[PDB]
Design a protein around this ligand. Structure first.
Ligand SMILES: *[C@@H]1O[C@H](CO)[C@@H](O[C@@H]2O[C@H](CO)[C@@H](O[C@@H]3O[C@H](CO[C@H]4O[C@H](CO[C@H]5O[C@H](CO)[C@@H](O)[C@H](O)[C@@H]5O)[C@@H](O)[C@H](O)[C@@H]4O)[C@@H](O)[C@H](O[C@H]4O[C@H](CO)[C@@H](O)[C@H](O[C@H]5O[C@H](CO)[C@@H](O)[C@H](O)[C@@H]5O)[C@@H]4O)[C@@H]3O)[C@H](O)[C@H]2NC(C)=O)[C@H](O)[C@H]1NC(C)=O
Ligand SMILES: *[C@@H]1O[C@H](CO)[C@@H](O)[C@H](O)[C@H]1NC(C)=O
Lengths: 110, 125, 48
């Protein structure tokens, strides 16, 4: 089935919030590659993070990753208007046919 | 690298449509490719996958109805869709994935790095 | 080795690209191919 994301999160500008990603160890013990995706409204997905804490190309420092075995956490600090977007957690492992995709969470800045 | 899409459009239930996905900077025929769809206001969902070897896996909900084929002269893939249903309405995406499978066996995985802008498909009566 | 009761702790070096991280704690590692296939050493007289 699908990973668990809370539908929506909210926070004040400049602060930090975390989006959680639960159920990672539901299917097998294979090493869980954890990925994160940003999508602005009307835009396509853009890859944010791989390997729970590994930043990708142009992603600033404000994005960080952590993990608790079955729950991953993507934290964003110094909240700003650009960050308002839809986020998707995903996990892949060897033998998978498709990587498991989260339900997505809308992040809004107050 | 870039991907560019065309096709899609309007169809009655049971009709047929077709979407092209062409690449630049690299050839489709030697990479891992994915077809996904997203219904309006909803989340992404898998549709089809073609490996570097060219064998294709379909999700059950479209097996027997959707078919992907390589267009090597155009350096593209084609999603042909027949027996269209209402549920098939949404925006479709063709995407490229980068992985590392050394001597067959895998060790490293990036994810989906290249994403087409998507084509709109509307099945209506 | 070799009395099948006296096991010993040994160590050696393997080029990184031949090692995979085990499906669990990052301190644990596995040979690249061993859940999947049989691995054989090449014999010195048979170097082709
Ligand atoms: C063997 O050795 C060779 C040589 O070392 C290795 O090749 C290297 O491989 C790297 C991995 O791909 C290459 O890095 C990529 O570079 C491209 C851009 O390269 C061009 O531009 C460089 C300069 O860019 C800067 O400056 C320009 C202005 O001049 C500025 O606009 C840029 O923003 C940037 O600041 C040149 O120096 C270079 O020669 C070349 O002309 C870069 O775009 C790649 O990032 C990609 O990131 C993800 C995937 O990680 C991808 O999705 C991105 O696309 C997304 O974003 C773009 C917009 O940016 C959008 O169009 C897409 O639709 C997506 O939304 C993006 O493509 C990546 O950083 C490196 O260039 C290359 N080296 C050489 C000399 O070619 C090779 O890997 C080695 N192999 C092995 C096995 O060892
Ligand atoms: C070993 O496994 C435990 C179980 O969760 C974990 O807390 C610990 O961080 C692991 N150690 C390493 C080095 O991964």
């Amino acid at each position: 089935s699908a990973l668990a994301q809370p539908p929506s999160v909210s926070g004040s500008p400049g602060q930090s919030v975390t989006i959680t990603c639960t159920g990672i160890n539901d299917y097998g013990a294979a090493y869980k590659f954890v990925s994160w995706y940003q999508q602005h409204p009307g835009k396509e997905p853009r890859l944010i993070m791989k390997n729970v804490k590994d930043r990708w190309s142009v992603t600033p420092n404000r994005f960080s990753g952590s993990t608790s075995g079955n729950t991953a956490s993507l934290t964003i600090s110094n909240l700003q208007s650009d960050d308002e977007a839809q986020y998707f957690c995903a996990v892949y492992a060897g033998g998978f046919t498709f990587p498991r995709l989260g339900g997505g969470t809308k992040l809004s800045v107050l | 690298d870039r991907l560019f899409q065309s096709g899609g459009g309007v169809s009655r239930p049971g009709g047929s449509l077709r979407v092209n996905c062409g690449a630049s900077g690299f050839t489709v025929r030697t990479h891992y490719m994915y077809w996904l769809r997203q219904s309006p206001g909803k989340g992404l969902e898998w549709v089809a996958f073609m490996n570097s070897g060219g064998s294709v896996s379909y999700v059950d909900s479209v097996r027997g109805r959707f078919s992907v084929s390589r267009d090597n002269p155009a350096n593209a893939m084609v999603l042909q869709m027949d027996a269209l249903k209402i549920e098939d309405t949404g925006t479709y995406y063709c995407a490229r994935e980068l992985r590392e499978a050394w001597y067959g066996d895998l060790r490293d995985y990036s994810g989906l790095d290249v994403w087409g802008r998507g084509t709109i498909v509307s099945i209506s009566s | 080795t070799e009395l099948r009761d006296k096991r010993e702790k040994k160590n050696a070096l393997f080029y990184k690209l031949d090692i995979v991280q085990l499906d669990g704690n990052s301190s644990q590692y596995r040979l690249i191919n061993c859940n999947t296939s049989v691995i054989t050493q090449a014999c010195p007289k048979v170097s082709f």
